[PDB]
């Protein structure tokens, strides 16, 4: 089965509106980059509310993973930041549509709302959250953004992009998440500070204060043992 | 009758490598933006060379327009800069493929030399011309780039892009060029200087010196009379 790889059927271009939105976010929040974490944690919380709602009516909802958490891991050696939730997850089709295109039926209005909020010197920090496009703020600190996800209705898939295009492939590691999503950031050289535990704990603790689900950060304590530390 | 519009068959996404290339050009030449005009004049000359070579074997080559020139026009009120040549032109298929994708079988190595130059503080100004991707430097000064072209083997078409996507449509004005291409730039606000005659003349005069085709600028002379003025 070499049809898929040889035909590049795993490669996609972003919808024009998304390209424009990514640029708007990056040029508006250039001064407050740390907000990407708040947006990822917020998306995580939302994904967990969704599976929680589904579990109300679907008895098999939490079979792939019994917990409802958000776990963060800093891999300094690999220069990677991971944010994992055991939320509803996304199917292969959802990864392409939810991350590659924009809807909300208020795109143009928000498109003019973002620019106007950045030509008259305003804040776009609260706007991106409102329109549900916080995910893209990840590019403020990452050269590469990777999304591994497992939804009950599909097999585990990986989405990856450097903002100039994106690809979606079946995860060769198989089903490792159970259910949920991991956002993996390959940090820009200048964003290395986010590989520091103290910086992440302070930020996470700062943005986890109003999150109803438990958020942990893989951290070290004193020999030197590692384990999940509750932040909220 | 209106399938193209109802299906957006006229819209295209850029190839990934082109997105990356446009970014590298803008990130490394932000200091010497005026080079866009050198590149457009250079491409125009190359287009005139092509039709000249075709006229050697084809006696009907120049029937659509006998002259071999480059005519530049400033339109301050409309915030536009036009660069028109009577070269070989481009068919609809060439507009889609040539401006939307990249070949040369050396894109990879070039994107490496570009990024490398930005790391060693080298001059990428010479590099882009050598690889034949000078067209993209227009985005250094324009929010929108429009390409109207007429090739002997097709009808007049229009290519347009704000860099987040591009579309190609049949020109509803019909065949107004005869043969050739017009590059129209909708200038960025920070690029208003290029709407000033004295400035454009100074740049065209400088960049046209070694061009073997006459290059003109639509200018005024003391009543106030407007006409083409030879620059080389």
Q: Which domain holds residue B3?
A: 1-232
- The answer to whether B63 and B153 have CB atoms below 8 angstroms apart is no
Reduced to 3 states (helix: H, G, I; strand: E, B; else coil), residue B79 is coil
Instruction: Write the DSSP assignment of B19-31 as a string of letters.
Output: HHHHHHHHHHSTT
Approach to solving: X-ray
Is A165 in Cβ contact with B23 (below 8 Å)? Answer: no
* Smallest Cα distance from A1 to chain B, Å: 25
Q: How many domains, chain A?
A: 1
Cα–Cα dist A36/B176, whole Å: 51
Strands A70-75 and A215-221: parallel
Please tell me which residue of chain A has the smallest CA distance to B11. A16
Query: Which residues 162-201 in chain A show a CB within 8 A of chain B?
Result: 163-165
User: Which residues, at least 6 apart from A137, have a Cβ–Cβ distance to it below 8 Å?
Assistant: A25, A29, A35, A36, A39, A128
Label residue A189 exposed, middle or buried (CB < 10 Å: 0-12, 13-18, 19+): exposed
Q: Which chain A residue has the Cα nearest residue B18?
A: A164
Category of A23 on φ-ψ map: left (φ > 0), alpha (ψ -120 to 50) or beta:
alpha
* Element containing residue B229 per DSSP (H, E): strand B225-230
Contact A27, A137 (CB under 8 A): no
Exposure b/e, A109-137, CB count within 10 A at least 16 = b: ebbebbeebbeeeeebbebbbebbbbbbb
> Which of chain A's residues have a Cβ under 8 Å away from the Cβ of B164?
16, 19-20, 23
Strand B70-75 versus strand B215-221 pairing type: parallel
Question: In this structure, what CATH number is given to the domain that contains residue A25?
Answer: 3.30.565.10
User: Does residue A108 belong to the interface with chain B, where contact is any CB pair within 8 Å?
Assistant: no
Query: Within 13 Å and on the Cβ side, how many CA atoms surround B219?
Result: 17
Which residue, A70, A77, A91, A93, is CA-closest to A183?
A70
Specify the resolution in Å.
Answer: 2.0
Q: Among all residues of chain A, which has the CA nearest to that of B20?
A: A164
Residue B144 corresponds to which tokens in the numbers above? 């929108």
**Which residues of B are known binding-site members for ATP?**
43, 85, 98, 135
Nearest-neighbour CA in chain A from B76: distance (Å) = 22
Cβ contact B164–A16 (<8 Å)? yes
**Measured between beta carbons, which residues in chain A are less than 8 angstroms from residue B20?**
164
Nearest residue to A147 via CA among A61, A50, A47: A47
* The two structure tokens encoding residue A190: 């200048």
A162 is in an annotated binding site: no
Crossing angle, helix B107-120 and helix B16-28, to 10 degrees? 20
Q: For residue A2, give both structure tokens.
A: 């070499």
């Amino acid at each position: 089965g070499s049809h898929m790889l040889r035909e590049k059927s795993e490669k996609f271009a972003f919808q024009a509106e998304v390209n424009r939105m990514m640029k708007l976010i990056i040029n508006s929040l250039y001064k407050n980059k740390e907000i990407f974490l708040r947006e990822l944690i917020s998306n995580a919380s939302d994904a967990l509310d969704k599976i929680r709602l589904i579990s109300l009516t679907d008895e098999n909802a939490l079979a792939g993973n019994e917990e409802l958490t958000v776990k963060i891991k800093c891999d300094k050696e690999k220069n990677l930041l991971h944010v994992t939730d055991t939320g509803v997850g996304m199917t292969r089709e959802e990864l392409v549509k939810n991350l590659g295109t924009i809807a909300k039926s208020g795109t143009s209005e928000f498109l003019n709302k973002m620019t106007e909020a950045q030509e008259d010197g305003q804040s776009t920090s609260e706007l991106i959250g409102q329109f549900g496009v916080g995910f893209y703020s990840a590019f403020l600190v990452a050269d590469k953004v990777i999304v591994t996800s497992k939804h009950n209705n599909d097999t585990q898939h990986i989405w990856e992009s450097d903002s100039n295009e994106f690809s979606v492939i079946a995860d060769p590691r198989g089903n490792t998440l159970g259910r949920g999503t991991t956002i993996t950031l390959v940090l820009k050289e200048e964003a290395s500070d986010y590989l520091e535990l103290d910086t992440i704990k302070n930020l996470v603790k700062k943005y986890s204060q109003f999150i109803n689900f438990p958020i942990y950060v893989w951290s070290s304590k004193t020999k030197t043992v590692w384990d999940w530390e509750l932040m909220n």
